[PDB]
Write a protein that binds this ligand. Structure first.
Ligand SMILES: O=P(O)(O)OC[C@H]1O[C@@H](O)[C@H](O)[C@@H](O)[C@@H]1O
Ligand SMILES: O=P(O)(O)OC[C@H]1O[C@@H](O)[C@H](O)[C@@H](O)[C@@H]1O
Ligand SMILES: O=P(O)(O)OC[C@H]1O[C@@H](O)[C@H](O)[C@@H](O)[C@@H]1O
Ligand SMILES: O=P(O)(O)OC[C@H]1O[C@@H](O)[C@H](O)[C@@H](O)[C@@H]1O
Ligand SMILES: OC[C@H]1O[C@H](O)[C@H](O)[C@@H](O)[C@@H]1O
Ligand SMILES: OC[C@H]1O[C@H](O)[C@H](O)[C@@H](O)[C@@H]1O
Ligand SMILES: OC[C@H]1O[C@H](O)[C@H](O)[C@@H](O)[C@@H]1O
Ligand SMILES: OC[C@H]1O[C@H](O)[C@H](O)[C@@H](O)[C@@H]1O
Lengths: 871, 867
C-alpha cells in the first residue's frame, strides 16, 4: 500500500544487481587510475600508500600509547603486547572547527590527562596514532593530511605532518614526551586489529561517521612506491568516488542537497550516500519533500521536521530494529512535533529501509571490485579473503551487516569471504604497526652505529695525516729505517724502447717509440698456475711474452720494467724484491733481484734491461711528461701507494746531500706497526687476518680495489647475522670472497641512479635484495669508499705538506700523476680525496693528473734518460 | 679437401641457424635490457636515444655545413636542400690518439679550409655533425661522448659535449662562426640519407671500420625518454653486445686474442667479430696458429705473417672476389711465405668462414630488430639504410646477409637500400629540424616576453594605481575615474548572504558560531530579471530559516554583494554595473536593498557590504592590524581603511572609512594598454563586459585561463604547438579552470602527469606540448600575481603616506579560490609587495570563514549604532 508507493517514489535509490555490478566495474577503473603514476593526480579515488606491508607476525611486543581520532569518539589508549586501557575524550565542535594549534593543544592535554590517570606521565613511549583522514605518507612515522572529511575543519593542518604538529603541541607543554609515532588510517588500524586474530585479513572496512576501506595490493601495482616485492596496504579513500561526476547518474536530488548543506561541499560524495553522518538527514530530506508534496502527514510539516539534523541515523537503526518498528517510527516523528498515522509510520519505516539498504549495497559494489582484484592477484579459481570491519553503522544498525554480507557474496559468487567484526578498535592494530616502526627505527640506528666507526672527522684525518708524516720520517732516517713500516724506498730516479707493466690488473708488454711518444702494447694473461708457481715459471712466461710481442711488432731493445711491488733498489738496474703484495705468491722470488731472475730467464731462451721502477714512479713520469709540475705518483687500483721527489739530504740511505731523488713510499704498509689500530674496525681485522699477507699492507687494505669489497662484505655479513639485513639468512654466495669488485662498487654508488636501478645491480651480482636491503648495501659501500678516499687524501695531504716544508716554501703548487682502476671508475673517490687534500693541506695547490697511457710510458722515459747517461 | 679440414678446425666459427636464432633471442633480451629504465644502467647494449623521431619530410630546407667523423674517411661537407660538395681530410694517427684539444683544432682547421675552398667563410651556417661513437644526448644539439671505440683515443673528450668542444675550437680561431649544431651517430645519418629517397626506411646499418645499427622504436618502449607518442630512432650500439660475457660460448680464442691486442680491451666484443678493422687480423691469427701447429706452410713462419696487421680486410675482399687461389698465393707470398696450392686453399676458406660469420652475426641481431619492428606495427615491409666499407666493398657480404636475414625473418618484405651520398645528407636533414625547433622555441619565448614585467614596469603599475586611487577618491574627478574608491560606510543572532563568488550562500551567524547552506542559481535566474533573481534569493532565505529551524523569524541581515555599488549609506547601495558572469536585467542603477525588500513583500536588511569588505572584517576579528581586504577568486578587488579627510565624497574629516576600490576596473581608461597584449584584448572583447574590468581580467580566475587558451591558440595556428592542429576543445571557453591552472603548475608533478592532466581536460598532448603549456600558464599566473602585488603595494604605501608614518605594519585579509589553490600566486604576490613596498611590513591572512562572518559583524555593529 504505502510501502509499494514509496518504492515507486524512491525507485532510483533502489539499486539492482545490474547497476550494482556496473558501479563496481567503474570503481575498479578508479582503483587503477589512483594507483598509476601518471593518472594518480587526476584520480578521485586516491589509493593512498600506507607502508603497512603485513598483518601481525606474532613477534610484536612492547608498551604503547595510542590516539584514535576521526570517528564518533576521540580516544587515548594504552596497549601492551594484549592488555589495553582507554578513555574517551570530548572534542567541542568549536575546536573541531577551530585552529590546528587549538586542536592539537587539546589532543596533547587529553593525552597528558590520561598518562597522569594511568601514572605513566614520565615514561617515554612510542605512539600508535589512528588518524581517520586521507594522508600522504612515505613512511609509517609521518602523515601529511591531504584533506579533512566528515565534521572536521581546522585551519592550517591540511598539507602538514600530523606527527610534527602533535610533537609541537606536546613540546608547548613540557609535561611529558613520546618516542616514535606511527600513523595509520582507521581502515588500516582496523585491518590490523582483526588480522591480529586472523592473519588472512586483507581488507579494512569502516562504515561509521564516514566510510572507507583499505586493502593489501601487490607492490608491482603500486606505482607510487618503488618496489615490486610482496604487498602493501592501500587506503583507497573511496568516500571520494564520484567526486569527479562518475556517479551522477546514481546520485539523486537528495544527495545533491545533503551536499549543498555539507561542511565539505563537492567532496566525499560516495560517502555522503552511505555513512552514518549523512543517512539520518538523507531520510529527513526525503520526508520533508514528500510532506511538501502532500504525500505524508497530509501535507503538513512541523518546524522540527524542517530543521537540519533532527532525524538521526540512530533513529534509522532504532526504527528498523525495534520489535514495534511502526511504534518506534511514531515515537521519532512525535519528537519531531508530528502526529502521524499508521500509514505515515509505515512510509517512514520504509524510507529508513530504502536509505540504509542502499548504503549497504553501495559498499557491496565497491567491496566486490576489491575482492575481484584480490582474486586476480592470487591467481586462484575461486578466492578466500577476510575483511575486518568497524564503525557505528555496521556494528549498531540491526540489518546493514547482513544485507552487506549477502549482497557482496552474490555479486562475487566465486568468492569465499569472512567478515570479522573488530571488538577492540583501531588502537590495537595501530600498536601493532608501531611495533614495527619502532623495530625498523631501532635496526636502522644499530646499522648506523656500526657504520659510525668507519666515518672519520676532520680532526681524525689531521691525525692520520700527522701519523703518516712521522712514519715518513721514520723510514727516511737510516737510524730507524729497518724498523719502519713505511719504507720510503730510494728508487734512483733523479729512441725505441720496450716496457713491461707487471702487478696491476693487466700484464702488458709495450713498444715505446720516442721522437712525441708513440706507444703500442699487448696484454698477456698470466694463468693461476704460473702465478702461484715458481719464479722460474713466472719469468719464463714473462720472457715468452716479450718474444711473442717482438714478433707481433715485426721486430733487441732497452727495457723499462714496471714492477709494482716493494723492491730494494741498490741502483736503477739492481732491484731486490722485499715481499710480494696484492695477490702475487710465487716462490724463489722474494729476497732475490728481479733483474737477475729476468736475465737468467732470458738466457734460457737477449735484451737490455736498463731500469726497474714501481708503478707509482712510472705513472709519475708518464704524467710529468705532460706537466713540469708533476712531482708525485699515486696509485689507487688493485693496491695503493705513492712516490714523490724527496731531497737527497733527507734520503739518508743514499750518500749525497745535493739534488733530488724519487722515493717509493710503499704506504700500503702504513699501520703495520699498530699506528692506526684505533681507526681500524673488526671488519678491517677480518679482511687482514683472512688475507695472504696477514698483518701486512694495512693502510692499503682500507683503501684499494682488492680489499674494499671485503670490508663491505664482512659488514653486510655482520648485519645479517644481527638480523639487520637480508632477513637474517647468509646466502652461501655472500660467504664468497671477492664478489664486490671495483666495477660493482663504483656502479652501486653512482648518483645518476635510482634505487630499483641499484637494486638491479645487486640482483645482477646474485644477491637477492629488496629495495630496503639495497639502500643499506649502497650506504655500507658509500661509507667504505668515502673512508678510503679520505684516508688516501690524508696520506697525500702528508706528502704535499712534506714537499712544501722540505723546500721551506710558504705555499706549494704541485701536480700528482694518478692511475688505478678504483680511482678512474669510482664516481666520488676522486673528488672526496681531492676535497680531503684541499682541507687538510691548506697551504698547497694540488692538481691531480689522471694518467691515460699507463706506467709503461714513464718507464720508457727513465730508461731513455739512463741510456743517454751511459753514453 | 683442406676445405673440410679447415671447417672442422674452424668449427666454432661456422654458425648454424640454431645458434644464430639463439644469438637473436639473446639480443632481443639485451634490447629490452637497454630500453628499460631500471636495467639500462647496466645494459651492455645501450639503446641510446637520438632524438630523431622521423625520416625526412620534404619540409627540410637550408644551407648546412656538415662533418663526418669516425669512419675510414673524415669528411667536411656542404649540403643545400639536394646539392652536396665534400672534401676528405686525413686525421693523423697521433692526432686520433692525441688530445681532445688537438683533435678538435684539426677539425676546426679542416672546416675553416673547406669554407675557404667554397668561399663561404663569412657565413654563419648550421652544421650536422655525424660523430660515429656512443654519445649521451637529451636533445639533437648536444652529445656527450660515452666512449671512444675503433681506432680513436683522444684524452679529455669522453664525458664532454662534442658540440661544446667544437665550439671552443672555432672561437680559438675567430676565423669564422657556425650556428646550431645537431649531432647524429652515422647509423642515424645513414638511416636518414636513405630515408630521403625511401621514406619507409626504419633501420640504419653500418658494417665498415666498426659495426652498429639503429632503428625506429616506439616511444612507449623507450623508458629512457619521457613520452609515449610516436617513435624515435634508437642507436643500439650493438658493437658492445657480449661485453658482459653474454656471447662467451660463441666467441673463440682468436676473438680473445684480437681483444688483448686492441686499443679498447674488453669493449666492443661483438664488433670485433664482425667489422673491417678486425676481420683481416682475425684471419692472420688463424693462419698464425695453424702454421704453429704444423698444419699449414709446413710450419715455416715468416716475420710478416707474425707482424700485426699485415693481413688486411682488403686481402679478404680481394681473395674472395677475383681465381680465389692465385690471389691467395700472391697475398701469402707478399707476407714472405712460400705457400702450396693447399695452403692457398685453406687461406681462401678461412677468409670465407670469417667474412661469412661476420655477415651472419649481423643477420642474427638484425633478425631480432625486424621481429621487434614487426610486433610494433602488428603484422612486415621495412627498408634498411646501409653503408660501410665491408658491405659496400666486400664481394659476398651483402648477399650473405640479405639471404641469412630474409631466411631468418620469413614473413618480411625487406628492401636493403645502399647509401651513395653518406651520412652528411641525412645529418643535414636532422639539422634542418634542430634549427626549426630552435626557431619555434625562439618565437614562443618572444611572445611570452610580452607577459613578463620588470621591476620597473611593476613600479610603474604601482604608480599608475596610486594616481587612479587619488583620482577616484576626489569629488572633482571621481565621476571620470575608472578606479572608483567607493565609500562603504564601514568605520546576538544574524543572517548573512554571500552573493557573487563561486557559491551563493545564506548564513546564520551566532555571536562565533556559523552555519550555511549553498543554493544554486540556475541559468534561468542568472540571466533572467532582477525580480526573478531576488525572488530566488528570497525563496532561499526562506528555505534557510526553516532549515535552521526558525521559520519566518525576522533577523537582521548582512548582505555580501560582490559587485560595484554606490553606497549612500550602509543600507542603501546602488548596483553600478554587473561584473564577472552576472547579467540579470533591470538591476544596474537600482538600489539592491529595495529590490530585495520588494521580493520579500511578494512573499530586516541592516547592511550591504562588498566581499573585500566582509573579508577585511572576517579577518580583522582575529587580527587588529587587518585594515585591507583582497579578493583573488572569480574576480579581483581590494578595499582598505581610508582617512575620512581623503574621502571627499563623504562630508567629514575625522576618523576612517573603508573604501571599496573596485580595482578590477583599473585600466578601463586605457592606462594599462601598454602592458596589455593581443590576448588580453581578445579576452576582453569576447567577454560579457567588453571594455570593463580590464585589470581584473589580467589577474582573476575567471579570466586567466582564457588568456592561456588564447596564447595556446595563437601558438598552435602559428605552427608552434599541437602540430598546428586547433583541437576543437581548445576552442571551448572556460576549460582552463582555476583548479587546473593550479594543478598544472605544481612542483610535484612529473611531466607525464602534467600531460595526463591535459588529456583529462580533453587536449591531446605530447610531453613537449606539455612543457609549453605549463610555461604559458606559469608566465600568465606569474604576471597575474605580480600585477596584484603592484596594486597592493600602492595600497599599503598609501595607508602609510596617509598617516605620515615611515614604517607600516599591516595585515591584509584574503579570500578567493585562485589565491588559495594556486601553488605560487600567494608567494609571488607577497614577494612583489615586499620588493615594491619596502617600508611596509605586510602580512596576508587567509579567511577561513568566508565573507559572511565579516558581513554579520558589521551588521552587529550597525544594530549597535541604533541603540
Ligand atoms: O565513526 P565511528 O562510528 O566512530 O566508526 C569508525 C571508528 O570506529 C572505532 O571503533 C575505531 O577505533 C576508529 O579508528 C574508527 O574511526
Ligand atoms: O691495479 P690496477 O687497477 O690495474 O691499477 C694500477 C696499474 O694501473 C695501470 O694503469 C698502470 O699501467 C700500472 O703500472 C699500475 O700497476
Ligand atoms: O668506417 P667506414 O668503412 O668508412 O664506414 C662507415 C662510414 O661510411 C660513410 O659512408 C658514412 O658517411 C660515415 O658517416 C660512416 O662513418
Ligand atoms: O570567487 P571565489 O573564488 O569563490 O572567491 C571569492 C568569494 O570567496 C568566498 O569565500 C567569500 O566568502 C565571498 O564573499 C567571496 O566573494
Ligand atoms: O572514518 C572513516 C573514513 O572517513 C572518511 O572517509 C575519511 O576521509 C577516511 O580516512 C576514513 O577511513
Ligand atoms: O699497484 C700499486 C701498489 O700496489 C702494492 O701496494 C705494491 O706494494 C706497491 O708497490 C704498488 O705501488
Ligand atoms: O661506425 C660504426 C660504429 O662504430 C663503432 O661501433 C661506434 O661505437 C658506433 O657508434 C658506430 O656507429
Ligand atoms: O569578488 C571580488 C570582486 O569581483 C569583482 O571585481 C567585483 O567588481 C567586486 O565587487 C568584487 O569585490
Amino acid at each position: 500500500d504505502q510501502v509499494q508507493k514509496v518504492d515507486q517514489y524512491l525507485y532510483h535509490m533502489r539499486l539492482s544487481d545490474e547497476t550494482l555490478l556496473e558501479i563496481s566495474k567503474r570503481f575498479r577503473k578508479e582503483m587503477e587510475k589512483g594507483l598509476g603514476a601518471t593518472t594518480h593526480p587526476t584520480a578521485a579515488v586516491k589509493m593512498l600508500p600506507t607502508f603497512v606491508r603485513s598483518t601481525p607476525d606474532g613477534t610484536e611486543h612492547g608498551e604503547f600509547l595510542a590516539l584514535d581520532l576521526g570517528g564518533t569518539n576521540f580516544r587515548v589508549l594504552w596497549v601492551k603486547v594484549v592488555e589495553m586501557e582507554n578513555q574517551i575524550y570530548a572534542i567541542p565542535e568549536d575546536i573541531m572547527r577551530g585552529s590546528g594549534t587549538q586542536l592539537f593543544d587539546h589532543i596533547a592535554e587529553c593525552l597528558a590527562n590520561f598518562m597522569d590517570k594511568l601514572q605513566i606521565k614520565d615514561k617515554k613511549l612510542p605512539l600508535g596514532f589512528t588518524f581517520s583522514f586521507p594522508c600522504h605518507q612515505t613512511k609509517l612515522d609521518e602523515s601529511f593530511l591531504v584533506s579533512w572529511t566528515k565534521g572536521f575543519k581546522s585551519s592550517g593542518v591540511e598539507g602538514r605532518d600530523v606527527v610534527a604538529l602533535i610533537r609541537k603541541a606536546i613540546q608547548r607543554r613540557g609535561d611529558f614526551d613520546i618516542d616514535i609515532v606511527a600513523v595509520v588510517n582507521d581502515t588500516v588500524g582496523t585491518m590490523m586489529t582483526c588480522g591480529y586474530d586472523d592473519h588472512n585479513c586483507e581488507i579494512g572496512l569502516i562504515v561509521g561517521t564516514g566510510s572507507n576501506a583499505c586493502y593489501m595490493e601487490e607492490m608491482r601495482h603500486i606505482d607510487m612506491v618503488e618496489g615490486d616485492e610482496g604487498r602493501m596496504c592501500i587506503n583507497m579513500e573511496w568516500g571520494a568516488f564520484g567526486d569527479d561526476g562518475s556517479l551522477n547518474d546514481i546520485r539523486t536530488e537528495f544527495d545533491q542537497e545533503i551536499d549543498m548543506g555539507s561542511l565539505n561541499p563537492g567532496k566525499q560524495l560516495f560517502e555522503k550516500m552511505i555513512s552514518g553522518m549523512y543517512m539520518g538527514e538523507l531520510v529527513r530530506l526525503i520526508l520533508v519533500k514528500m510532506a511538501k508534496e502532500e504525500l505524508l502527514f497530509g501535507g503538513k510539516l512541523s518546524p522540527e521536521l524542517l530543521n537540519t539534523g533532527r532525524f538521526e541515523t540512530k533513529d534509522i537503526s532504532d526504527i528498523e530494529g525495534e520489535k514495534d518498528g511502526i511504534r518506534k517510527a511514531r515515537e521519532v516523528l512525535m519528537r519531531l512535533g508530528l502526529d502521524p498515522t499508521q500509514e505515515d509510520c509505515v512510509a517512514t519505516h520504509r524510507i529508513c529501509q530504502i536509505v540504509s539498504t542502499r548504503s549497504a549495497s553501495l559498499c557491496a559494489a565497491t567491496l566486490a571490485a576489491v575482492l575481484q582484484r584480490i582474486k586476480e592477484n592470487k591467481g586462484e579459481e575461486r578466492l578466500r579473503s577476510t575483511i575486518g570491519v568497524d564503525g557505528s553503522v555496521y556494528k549498531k544498525h540491526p540489518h546493514f551487516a547482513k544485507r552487506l554480507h549477502k549482497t557482496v557474496r552474490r555479486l562475487v559468487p566465486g568468492c569465499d569471504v569472512r567478515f570479522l567484526r573488530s571488538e577492540d578498535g583501531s588502537g590495537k592494530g595501530a600498536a601493532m604497526v608501531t611495533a614495527v616502526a619502532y623495530r625498523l627505527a631501532d635496526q636502522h640506528r644499530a646499522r648506523q652505529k656500526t657504520l659510525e666507526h668507519l666515518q672519520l672527522s676532520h680532526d681524525q684525518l689531521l691525525e692520520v695525516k700527522r701519523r703518516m708524516k712521522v712514519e715518513m720520517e721514520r723510514g727516511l732516517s737510516k737510524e730507524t729505517h729497518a724498523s719502519a713500516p713505511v719504507k720510503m724506498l730510494p728508487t734512483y730516479v733523479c729512441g725505441d724502447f720496450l716496457a713491461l707493466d707487471l702487478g696491476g690488473t693487466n700484464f702488458r708488454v709495450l713498444l715505446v717509440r720516442v721522437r712525441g711518444v708513440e706507444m703500442h702494447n699487448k696484454i698477456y694473461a698470466i694463468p693461476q698456475e704460473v702465478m702461484h708457481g715458481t719464479g722460474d715459471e713466472l719469468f719464463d712466461h714473462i720472457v715468452q711474452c716479450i718474444a711473442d710481442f717482438l714478433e707481433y711488432m715485426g721486430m733487441s731493445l732497452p727495457l723499462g720494467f714496471t714492477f709494482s711491488f716493494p723492491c730494494q733498489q741498490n741502483s736503477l738496474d739492481e732491484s731486490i724484491l722485499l715481499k710480494w703484495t696484492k695477490g702475487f705468491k710465487a716462490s724463489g722470488c722474494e729476497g732475490e733481484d728481479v733483474v737477475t731472475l729476468l736475465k737468467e730467464a732470458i738466457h734460457r731462451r737477449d735484451l737490455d734491461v736498463v731500469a726497474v721502477v714501481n708503478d707509482t714512479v712510472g705513472t709519475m713520469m708518464t704524467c710529468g711528461f705532460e706537466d713540469p709540475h708533476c712531482e708525485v705518483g699515486l696509485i689507487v687500483g688493485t693496491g695503493s701507494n705513492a712516490c714523490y721527489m724527496e731531497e737527497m739530504r733527507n734520503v739518508e740511505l743514499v750518500e749525497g746531500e745535493e739534488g733530488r731523488m724519487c722515493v717509493n713510499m710503499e704506504w700500503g704498509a702504513f699501520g703495520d706497526n699498530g699506528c692506526l689500530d684505533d681507526f681500524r674496525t673488526e671488519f678491517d681485522v677480518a679482511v687482514d687476518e683472512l688475507s695472504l699477507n696477514p698483518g701486512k699492507q694495512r693502510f692499503e687494505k682500507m683503501i684499494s680495489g682488492m680489499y674494499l669489497g671485503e670490508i663491505v662484505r664482512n659488514i653486510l655479513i655482520d648485519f645479517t647475522k644481527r638480523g639487520l639485513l637480508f632477513r637474517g639468512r647468509i646466502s652461501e654466495r655472500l660467504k664468497t670472497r671477492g664478489i664486490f669488485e671495483t666495477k660493482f662498487l663504483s656502479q652501486i654508488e653512482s648518483d645518476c641512479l635510482a634505487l630499483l636501478q641499484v637494486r638491479a645491480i645487486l640482483q645482477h651480482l646474485g644477491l637477492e635484495s629488496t629495495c630496503d636491503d639495497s639502500i643499506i648495501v649502497k650506504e655500507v659501500c658509500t661509507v667504505v669508499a668515502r673512508r678510503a678516499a679520505q684516508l688516501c687524501g690524508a696520506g697525500m695531504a702528508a706528502v704535499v705538506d712534506r714537499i712544501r716544508e722540505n723546500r721551506g716554501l710558504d705555499a706549494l703548487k704541485v701536480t700528482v700523476g694518478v692511475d688505478g682502476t678504483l680511482y678512474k671508475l669510482h664516481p666520488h673517490f676522486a673528488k672526496v680525496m681531492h676535497e680531503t687534500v684541499k682541507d687538510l693541506a691548506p697551504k698547497c695547490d694540488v692538481s691531480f693528473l689522471q694518467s691515460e697511457d699507463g706506467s709503461g710510458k714513464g718507464a720508457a722515459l727513465i730508461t731513455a734518460v739512463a741510456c743517454r747517461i751511459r753514453e
